[PDB]
Design a protein around this ligand. Structure first.
Ligand SMILES: [Zn+2]
Length: 179
């Protein structure tokens, strides 16, 4: 397809009641699910990125890292909270105990898969705006994709930071849309 939808880290631990919740993150699930249905209908590639951490990951507080344990491989916290079609491409990131990966491109084959499927433009949604959404969007820009941010299908943790990240992405050429 020429376009792809990239759904970033829509997992149980990043939703309210999870180990690392994005405030009101569950509120965007109907709209993310709607975009998935829409892109599926447009015959677009659908990609879902997930944090897929081993126990004792370097980013966790048990290793002096910044975050509580979250999105551990083969646990309920790592499960998707969105409805994905059978032909969704699943990208698992940060799987090695001593390597972190914020962007869905970092340490993965995402660029290669996108190009292999003839993708030219990518639509980004998911959580959190100022963290893995931002990083993924900026990395897609690096690789030469036209990048869109789905305004009504992202959520971040702090309003001031979400604010800064959106302004930043726009300035670097990422287009903010909804439909
Ligand atoms: Zn993580």
């Amino acid at each position: 397809p020429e376009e792809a939808l990239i759904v970033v880290d829509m997992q149980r631990d990043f939703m309210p009641g999870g180990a690392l919740p994005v405030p009101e993150g569950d509120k965007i699930i109907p709209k993310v699910n709607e975009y998935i249905r829409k892109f599926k209908e447009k015959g677009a590639l659908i990609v879902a990125t997930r944090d897929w951490h081993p126990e004792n990951h370097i980013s966790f507080r048990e290793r002096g890292g910044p975050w509580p344990r979250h999105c551990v491989q083969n646990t309920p916290g790592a499960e998707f909270v969105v409805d994905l079609p059978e032909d969704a491409v699943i990208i698992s990131k940060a799987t090695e105990p001593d390597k972190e990966a914020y962007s869905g491109f970092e340490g993965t084959d995402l660029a290669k898969i996108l190009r292999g499927n003839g993708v030219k433009r990518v639509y980004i949604c998911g959580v959190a705006t100022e963290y893995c959404v931002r990083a993924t969007a900026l990395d897609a820009l690096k690789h030469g994709f036209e990048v869109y941010l789905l305004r009504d299908a992202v959520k971040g943790i702090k309003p001031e930071d979400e604010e800064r990240a959106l302004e930043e992405m726009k300035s670097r050429g990422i287009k903010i849309v909804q439909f």
